[PDB]
Amino acid sequence: GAPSLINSEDNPAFPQRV
Hints:
The PDB classes it as unknown function. By secondary structure, the chain is an all-beta fold. The chain contains no helices and two strands. A two-stranded antiparallel ribbon has the order 1-2.
């Protein structure tokens, strides 16, 4: 849910951190 190096939201387009 927040822009990040860590894509722990598993967004398929833009890396987003949970």
